[PDB]
Symmetry: D2
Subunit: 411 residues, 4 copies
């Protein structure tokens, strides 16, 4: 009795916003991945922060290895309603991942937390960490990992594990070439999610042992979790027990955005008729730096004609004139002149599309300025020559790609 | 030299948000007029507050006679980003109008301001008051009134004046039946705007003289301004000298929203191709309770068909499905199911329109829930019976009106 | 499991900050009692708000029936850390005590809380309401009252009750002339504390029944609690189960400041060697509007001599020169010139004491300006003539008394 | 007319809070110099920020070039009250001196500011920059430098200049070995203050051109100001025209805190009877992150004896018992047990002094824990052996020094 409320108070979160995502070729060149925009007005890291608040954890330690400017500006601007007088703060702790928490160890000790929540903030999900902690304490563990079945065809990109009846870790392997399958199913492999919970005093004792190691890669998956697994102190936490989902019949939603295609497919999943991820949830609202923007102004074309939309999102500040829109997502302050045709696109902020454009299966970067008459996504080899094109068919367009093409982005 | 900066630092604004917007019949029944929504995401009072900030005046005294909760929430949330050890504050001073500033006289003195800016916050405009204070000091005046020519056909609703070559007040009359016309034009009458500037020590001396008067109506226009005009200490300030207009060639924008038709016509003026009021202007921005809303989600109808829009605004949180929209303004969190036809409407927040509705020249009040099949604006006598209809043709729709009609509005 | 964390989120607090504080004769005439300053920089209402935060309840509804100006200022400055996404917000709901709640019923329905916490914010205490909600739900109750034993000699000022073995309410009487004593002790009477917890749907159903009552006093103690007691649905919650106290051996701290002597005695209780109330708690802190003040500047007198202090408090901004201080509490921006002798005093903010004063058992009101040579607390009849003096011996000094006396306070 | 109001709105500040602080050898090893505490609760950088607000510049760009966490935490907590819609914010732009402002050129342009104010935020002063901008535009300069006469015995640590009758720069030299004296006085040298004002367009071209130089040190003083001086476009701005000072007869206050002695002597200047720097100025106040702390609690010693103070400061949260204090400055949450004797010290926050200590001419670092019986400042050779001792006589004590001495600071 009186445990669920108490446990978040004694813990602190360590978002590992390292922004690698090397598959996002040029999208993360000038910004860490956690600060990638997603679903209108949000960043990715808000999904990690908002799950910390709504789960009760109001002490959060961001660890931006990249030392990025936009992430700092976002945390500073949006997540700046906290006062340390009440023991609620977002701490920016600039610097393998595991070593990165060792340099800021002397600060983390000053929090004097009993437990800690390691998070990878370059993911999209909803989870109630308090429900995870309860499962950590009831088992009397030292390390609680968030496990989730995934297809074996991509299990090589995560850490795979094998558990007993009591969710105790028996075997663990980090990024195997031939992932072991679950015993009751060959087509899937129980995978880690980059969400760990540690009892603090064990971690501090453990990291120093790793800091002195001359061979450790200083990574959680490759160095520490196998060591704890050898020690027999690690336990698992099936993610569906904690996944916040309106429909209990639906599957858990955890989207690794590691590549471009999944970024596009995940942003458009919002625009569909029945989204898998519900932002309208009022019991788990997601927060962000919400700048003041005028309403989404649709207008008539130069010819006085109307504009069509079909299964699309339109943020604040946008401006659209005529210009058939389909299956697309328009971020803030976008401008779309007349006679355009946009189909299954993702337009990041402050874009300015000219007249008579035609876009199909594209991802436009921030503040690009497409010229008049540009056509994208209809001829593969042409688009591959000008811009980057993935094997799936998706196209990416950044300021530099156009800059080299001779168009002007000064505006 | 160094004067324009020093002057706003010695002055404080007094917004008279009494909001006795009687001609707004039922729209202001449950809320003070300043807290009326206008333009998508804005109240009316922000126009008075934002002009005080952008003119440098960061001490503002809101004088909410009505003692509303919504206005106090708006000020508390949206406009309470201040630090008071730096002498910048929005202050709520609850209680004719002259007497409204006399009860809080003891509180006002403590600011120790040399000048004061009287404002009526139930109007819409943009003005740089530092440009007014400069014209106040250069003239060595004690009262500076903001004068603006207006059509004589409606000059009876304002205070009329007659000035000399030096903008000194010669004759003043408050709300005449036969307004005198300007000398150089019969069709117009130089009118007051409800914007006054007083040298502080004079005002305090003057109001006490009025408070002891057993016959004064305790109102600025009917009691004090005639007294100062008799004293020959009042001077005028033509509003074009201070009107912040993006397009210099255009005429100054001052909309008295006193009646319903002007509210509708002013909100739709935004939606036009070339708005008279530019809120996109970044050299004179306007603030508000910028709440967080998911993007404007357009979708397909039940039949999988598309949706059209034409010269319209769409706030955040809205949801539209098919449903042809024209010339309309949709405030936040509005839901519009399929087969609708909306034409020159103004839909305040949280409305829920059912299927197969048809709206024309209407104003929906907050959080109404229209039932399925409703038709508005096509038959005058029917709409006059069910709802309130103005002589111009405009229609007003309130929660109570439909409650009386029998459609349950609990949601 | 997992019910403790979700109990606060589903509830909302209703601070009844409308106390007349009639027993405090002139201290609270110009300010509502909750806004009375206490123990340095804090007000009284912060103890109610800070217990709501630290118990998890982040939705708070203030009610300000009488002299609602300073309180609004404080709430809008100190407690304007609004984050409407996650439904954590301090709300201002201006208008017997129940009557005040009913008028704002339609708003309270908009919070969609399962439970509600009624509080009297004109008291001083520390409590963890989540530990009350747990005791409310485990008993399966509908009304949970916070009970505390008190001396029978003053039990007439509170509501007395008599309970069975299971903390169920058997008998209840509001403010009796002859308080019934507890059965196991004649010298005490189990009393209410003005802290109630109601399951929301029961309250809304219940208040309308009371609103239609033509004879009810519209007060919680005299009308509703006897009704629920007759229904046999009220249960008690002994406060020691929830009192936050560093030393478990000490008694619970609940100070009704209802009279002047208790206000003085409570403020000086801080200054003692071992305070009964501990503000130095990292685990359970108390917030307030903390303006940037310079540090407490002690200096030399006109004669170059030193200043002594003994068991005293000194806020920020203060300035003490020489001037022996004892057992006293100095609020912010106090100024104390030389040759003074202060013994067991309570000096509210911005006081300016002149030279060669001598104060003993006094309470100075905000922003008074004592003249040179004034002597207080040494001759009873003289002090009774000039100022207000209580039967215990304490003296109160407001600006008005001095203004009448002839020492101007314009400074 | 209307110029001084309009000028700050078009300008932006660039705080160069990247100082290595080599001269403060141990104080700033773990923190940037701007984050050094000063005068109770303040940080040095607040003097530059508060001068930007109170001079009207509400766009400020901090440049935390290295070893900065504390600074980010201070800005993020205390100084983040972003408007962001009115165009007022505190940016953080992490990275010679000119390289720091070159790398963030892309971000800075985005402001579209006509003028810019280069500042060195590792100084203490009060200045109204709008008076500087007025003096900048009236002269038609492209670079305005803040000039101040200083003693020639230390002019070698600053940039020296020589001007004509119209404050135009004739000769300039950055950190000379033999400083030239002013013509009308040999004992002084007109020196730069690290406060520059540039017309924005000229600055970007100037910086871009500087970037390509393979021999420039990328510093303002050594590279750019000589180049502009050669061009004859640089003008001076005598600091007394802009120095904010209560007493006009006093000298201008600009304290370079470059060494430890000046840090001590400047903090103790506050504690004197008549401070040179006035924090008690309502018309020109200075902000800071002000955590809510309880009042300064003085108490009795173990023997029940009293405590003396003489020309001292005591912040909030402090606790003092007996323990004669003289000429000293006690920062927040200080603890001082009995029988202590403190004379002309500077105790940074969270210090814990044991019993029977004796301190003289010392500077204690944040969060030290002095042991019982320690004596400092009475035997020079002993203190030089244990801690750092300056040539002037001042002593610096930090945690690391104590840690090596065998004491334990784990508390
Ligand atoms: O006669 P006055 O000038 O109104 O003074 C009465 C006193 O009451 C107060 O308004 C009380 O203020 P607060 O309760 O808001 O602290 C003082 O500021 C004021 O000096
Ligand atoms: O880092 P050390 O050697 O443990 O010393 C610790 C102390 O120094 C500090 O880092 C000083 O930091 P600041 O200068 O940022 O206030 C404190 O955070 C801490 O209490």
């Amino acid at each position: 009795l009186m445990l669920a409320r108490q446990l978040p108070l004694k813990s602190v979160a360590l978002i590992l916003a390292g922004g690698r995502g090397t598959r996002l070729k040029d999208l993360t060149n000038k910004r860490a991945k956690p600060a990638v925009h997603f679903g209108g007005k949000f960043r990715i890291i808000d999904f990690a922060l908002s799950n910390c608040i709504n789960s009760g954890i109001r002490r959060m330690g961001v660890i931006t290895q990249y030392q990025s400017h936009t992430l700092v500006q976002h945390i500073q601007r949006g997540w700046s309603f906290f006062n340390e007088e009440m023991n609620e703060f977002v701490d920016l702790l600039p610097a393998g991942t595991a070593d990165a928490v060792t340099q800021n160890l002397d600060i983390i000790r000053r929090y004097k937390a009993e437990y800690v929540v390691i998070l990878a903030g370059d993911h999209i999900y909803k989870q109630d960490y308090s429900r995870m902690l309860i499962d950590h304490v009831e088992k009397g563990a030292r390390c609680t990992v968030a496990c989730m079945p995934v297809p074996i065809e991509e299990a090589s990109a995560f850490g795979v594990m094998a558990v007993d009846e009591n969710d105790k870790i028996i075997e663990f392997v980090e990024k195997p070439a031939n992932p072991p399958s679950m015993p009751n199913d060959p087509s899937k492999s129980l995978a880690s999610m980059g969400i760990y919970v540690f009892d603090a005093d064990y971690l501090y004792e453990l990291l120093e042992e790793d800091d002195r190691d001359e061979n450790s890669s200083h990574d959680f998956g490759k160095d520490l979790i196998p060591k704890i697994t050898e020690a027999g102190l690690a336990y698992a936490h099936p993610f569906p027990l904690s996944c916040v989902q309106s429909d209990p019949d639906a599957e858990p939603y955890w989207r690794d955005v590691g590549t471009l295609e999944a970024y596009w497919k995940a942003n458009l999943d919002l625009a569909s008729v029945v989204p898998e991820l519900d932002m309208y949830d009022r019991n788990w609202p997601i927060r962000t730096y919400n700048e003041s923007l005028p309403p989404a102004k649709f207008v008539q074309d130069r010819s006085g004609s109307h504009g069509m939309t079909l299964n699309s999102l339109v943020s604040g500040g946008c401006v659209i004139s005529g210009s058939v829109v389909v299956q697309s997502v328009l971020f803030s302050r976008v401008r779309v002149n007349s006679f355009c045709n946009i189909d299954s696109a993702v337009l990041l902020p402050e874009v300015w599309v000219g007249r008579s454009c035609r876009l199909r299966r594209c991802v436009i970067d921030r503040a690009c300025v497409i010229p008049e008459g540009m056509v994208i996504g209809e001829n593969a080899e042409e688009d591959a020559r000008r811009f980057y094109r993935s094997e799936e068919g998706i196209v990416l367009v950044t300021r530099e790609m156009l800059r080299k093409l001779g168009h002007k982005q000064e505006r």
